């Protein structure tokens, strides 16, 4: 992280143990639950990359997924190098313009990552760009770990409509589905993959019911 | 959240892990108990919307209810857009006047949400307006989850008048009932849905007893 | 709560989660033990009313007692309105003189509650007056929940004089008894409601023994 | 407690929940172990009396002992009133010279207790004097609760000399014994109340052994 | 650690208990897991050597490994002494130029270690150089404790391809293997040491599959 | 019929099925994005297991042209 000073220059405060441990305990307990994606951001809102890397590295389990995230950061990295050019030999006295690897803090140092993140001429935040990339690797894994696809989430003889709708929506977000499909699935597949006795009551409501109405109606059916 | 500086402009401090976890542990343990509504406010008294959204999102369970809250924020959102007009093309150099979605921080950024929340000309607090909306979705769910309606809370042969009155009042607040009804239910339905032996003693007190008198009298009856 | 600033006006800091939880865990575990009364004050020494109300409200159990406290705050409230007059239409630009409900923060806002609590002309602390009222409702409940009245606390064949005196004094404070009665009960009823074998030894000490002497003497009797 | 300010007067910071709870958990678990006396001081090094009283009061158990402490504070209190005279009617504008009860903060307020504790003309610390008194009541109780007197701490066939010496010294401090007696008991009663086989070996060392020598020698005897 | 002051010189703040305990609880629970290496750095980002030494020393178990680390710090130490010369008798008034042992803080004091770490003429950070050395001793131990070598990590009849790849990669990093070998092992030995039924499906993908494809394909095979 | 009910018969080709699917996809006036998801997924899910595995062996995000050729005589 970065803490500024009065009469002094910006300094690098370290990351904190509690936070390093919470991220570790949100991935080893929730088994890369979708929520892992925001937990990470919040725990990292103001962490320079060197620190983000130390956190992800403390986790020595689910190491296949972490490798997948590393592959994704390198692929996104290639795009930034291609789209952003080299101004040419940059005159000594100037910190090298940032690349996808310095953004990570691998080849670069925290002090240089703070320098770009705050340089007055063109501040390049090498702290938030990296997290975004990590979040695409985390998100794919969540999608690789939705044990049930939404088309298979249905209702058994003794399964109600409140637990089923919970199992459905939780998967729908984790599949990283788009919005229009979300509504169609929400207004149709919810009723299709259900017990018939409750289905008749959800259909008794009328057309385009609301989740409030669907839930209240099928209370005890 | 927002922390101001001396010699510097307002900055965005992040939300804290402990608080993100407490909200999560007040919803997964109390099963959206009514108290969830204030716990949220207190945990969020000074959180800009971006953060309020990160908290609600970390919870990946009870996701049906969270969807209901999202529907409610969008419905209230339509009202604000209708009631509050567009001054027209706003001259470049001016931050767009706030809408129901920027209030959420979805399409907007925290820096802009802080800018309106503190702009000197007409400070628009986009932090408290949003929470209020979230609280109406949370409140409906509590009402959707009062397992017993107050008209069904009664006294069995071995149920006393202290546990029953507790089960009654807890439901009365969670039903989000109005005040005049609250008093009538309080002075009448409490005695009606009760064991007769205790009922005779509560009636021996006189007319319009006080909960102190009702409770002390039916001690052991 | 209220935190003052240098070069800036007083601000409202929020209440803290840990404290909201401790009050909740001192009432759901001690079952409104007498100590609940001071725990509250200490946890609230510098909390503006809006916050005191949020804490009491997070507790959704023992809700009958909380209603009793609400009745007591309204009754005390009537007294303040009667004793303190209305200076008449107060000129615009002046915050309304405080009433029993603003003291609670119900109809009022924290900023106005801080304004009176610190107004230079006649600072009206709307923070401590309210707590005092809450403490009379809490105290009555403790008295409504002393399972044993002091006149019934006695000694059985295998009950000693150290556990009995503990059960006696704990009730004596919770009954909210007065001081002169406290001494008479202390020097007389302690010996009366006791095992005879120990009674003879407590009486062997002489007249007006001291709890030190009474306790040391009946060691093993 | 008291926190001073720059450009402002001294203020009263409150006591903290964690500390109120630790004192409570050092008395309900250690059953007024001697260590309770220092735990209290350290937890209270800078607490004005009002707070010291709130802590002791949160403990609603072992209430006989707390009453004994209250009797002791009143007895010491009489001595201060007798030894320290009344300068006579003190001119309005002057805070009353402190008495044993204001030192407690009972009849007095924290602001007045801070005023004497810091008054420039003759600062009277009403914070440390009170604690000292509380410590004499706590100490008597520890002495009233040494289950074994040192003259009864001895060695059985299978009791060694390391556990016995531990049981002996722990009692010796809790009896609040004097120093000269401490040495005689230490160099004599330790050997007297012991197993003979180990006694012969402790005596083989010579005269006035040291606890290092006594302990190393009787290793396995 | 080191905290600077305004109007005063740099001071040595101490290390914190929680951190001393976390390092101890990351080595006695993870049994020198590879992650121990970064946990240490993060917990020590800004700790002067004297403190780093106090932490490692609190751990009294796995003391063979700590001795190995001590041997490694002494061997690296010899290199620094050889490569860095003695400018000769350094004039009194000048702190001795740093050596490998002062870097540790053994023969040196924290104040001198802070003086070099911040001396304006040629700041020598004796805080980060030491940690680096400790990290080579920690890393060797992790390699001495990879119970399974990657050439022995294979798939049994009921072992899938997700747990196996996890056991493989975790070892690959802990063996401290190089990058080119990492890719060859990754694209070849992963398929070789596997169940044949899944092997046929991983081979059905084509050539140079990606861990995403390999993992999705062998789902249920 | 409807697209969430259309299913390839056990001894029916997945070709007969696609003609009973795209015909019912346009009729339902399904949105274009909802069309792509149903197209790349709901076809394979509501199909014979043998051809479902054969199209799954075809690879990721297959194209209908390839799906038809691979499930030929499947
Ligand atoms: O008291 P809190 O500030 O909420 O902190 C709690 C816990 O509280 P309790 O003692 O009431 O259970 C302990 O706090 P401290 O006593 O150390 O202040 C301590 O527990 P652990 O060491 O077991 O984690 C840890 O706080 P800290 O960072 O101050 O050590 C943290 O633990 P939990 O979050 O697990 O309750
Ligand atoms: O951890 P933070 O979120 O920054 O909170 C700090 C921090 O809490 P911890 O003690 O749990 O680390 C301080 O740490 P220390 O200075 O004790 O190391 C503590 O200081 P004090 O206990 O000395 O006051 C202070 O305490 P408090 O909550 O009583 O103000 C507390 O404050 P916040 O939680 O409000 O930030």
Residue numbers in the entry:
A (entry chain A), B (entry chain A), C (entry chain A), D (entry chain A), E (entry chain A): 1 to 221
F (entry chain B): 148 to 221
Article passage:
A cryo-EM map of the mature-like HIV-2 CA hexamer with C6 symmetry was resolved to 3.26 Å resolution. We observed density for IP6 in the central pores of both HIV-2 CA hexamers and pentamers, with clear density for R18 side chains. Density for a lower IP6 was also clear, though in the hexamer, it was less well resolved than the upper density, and likewise, K25 side-chain density was more modest. As had been posited for the HIV-2 capsid lattice, the central pore appeared most similar to the open N-terminal β-hairpin conformation of the HIV-1 CA hexamer central pore, despite HIV-1 CA occupying the closed conformation in the pH range used for HIV-2 assembly (between pH 7.5 and 8.0)85. However, considerable details underlying this structural plasticity differ. These differences also compound into identifiable changes in CA assemblies, with the central pore diameters expanding by ~2.7 Å in the hexamer and ~1.6 Å in the pentamer compared to HIV-1 at the Cα position of the R18 ring. Specifically, we observed an exchange of polar contacts, as the hydrogen bonding potential of helix 2 residues Q41 and E45 is met by either Y50 and Q54 in the hexameric conformation or N57 and Q54 in the pentamer, allowing a change in register as helix 3 slides along helix 2. In the hexamer, D61 and Q63 of one CA NTD form interactions with residues of the adjacent CA CTD, K170 and R173. However, the loop between helices 8 and 9 is shifted in the hexamer structure to allow Q176 in the CTD to contact residues Q139 and R143 in the NTD (bottom left). For both pentamers and hexamers, one of the most striking features of the map when compared with HIV-1 was the stronger density of the CypA-binding loop.
During HIV-1 or HIV-2 infection, the capsid is a necessary component that protects the viral genome and recruits host factors while trafficking to the nucleus. The capsid is comprised of approximately ~1,600 copies of CA molecules, which oligomerize into ~250 hexamers and 12 pentamers (capsomeres) to form the distinct fullerene cone. In this study, we leveraged the approach of templating the HIV CA lattice assembly on liposomes, together with stabilization by the small-molecule host factor inositol hexakisphosphate (IP6),75–79 to produce regular HIV-2 CA lattices. We report the first high-resolution structures of HIV-2 CA capsomeres in their native mature lattice using single-particle cryo-EM.
